[PDB]
Design a protein around this ligand. Sequence first.
Ligand SMILES: Cc1nc(Nc2ncc(C(=O)Nc3c(C)cccc3Cl)s2)cc(N2CCN(CCO)CC2)n1
Length: 287
Amino acid sequence: AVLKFTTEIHPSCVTRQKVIGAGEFGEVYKGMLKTKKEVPVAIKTLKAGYTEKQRVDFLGEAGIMGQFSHHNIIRLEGVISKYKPMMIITEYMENGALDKFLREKDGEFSVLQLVGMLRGIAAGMKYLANMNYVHRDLAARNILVNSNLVCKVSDFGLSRVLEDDPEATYPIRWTAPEAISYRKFTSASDVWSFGIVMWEVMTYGERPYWELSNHEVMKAINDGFRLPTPMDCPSAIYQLMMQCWQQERARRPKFADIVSILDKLIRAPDSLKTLADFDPRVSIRLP
Ligand SMILES: Cc1nc(Nc2ncc(C(=O)Nc3c(C)cccc3Cl)s2)cc(N2CCN(CCO)CC2)n1
């Protein structure tokens, strides 16, 4: 039923040009779509021999995305299902995944730009939550960035989301305690993950909890430790991420609250000049 909302695209309208992602059962390409001149698109394929579950999971991502229409959610152009290999075609995000982007652009943005990226992510997440969609895998690696610096939530589906992410192990350090301990994934566990994303953005893609093992992370969280403030981080931003990490689900902000706060800070940007204290890990003394 959900696929009837998607446009079926003829293969002659699609040219794959360059591989930008890859796995065992398909690749992601940058390419062009010619329905105006040709427009750039991203193209994900599913290779022949796929199972019934793989087909349901693959087209299910497109079916979910076709239900959404929001500035901060990746837009679906259409699908190729009548021909093989099958494909999903979306808008092309020129700057790729947010985690890699920030690590390759360390120090290159203003604090206001970084906070603007978080407001966009939060707006997309508010929309998903209100559409009754729990993401389960919110992380900077699953946000895409375009040439306007707009961040859009990516990576949709059911079981395929955690199955396909190599960070998800039998990822812990993005996941709220109740989701780990008793499998309770909700929009409030997505808020926990969003707090981790805030820390990823403000640190230019530092890995959460550094080299602590998964067990060490869980033990630290259960004992009350939390990630320390990033360098040069507005106090209001650190306070907000901390509240995303409340152990008690009910004490966490909703995405509605997050969007409202971030919007107010951006609209009075001097509010971002007050920085949380950074605890230095190296002492440099000079006479
Ligand atoms: C991984 C990656 N993606 C990029 N853009 C994308 N746009 C949309 C994507 C996407 O996957 N759509 C999608 C599809 C198609 C189906 C189902 C679901 C979805 Cl969400 S991927 C750009 C990019 N690069 C550009 C910048 N380079 C800098 C050098 O380091 C690095 C590589 N790399």
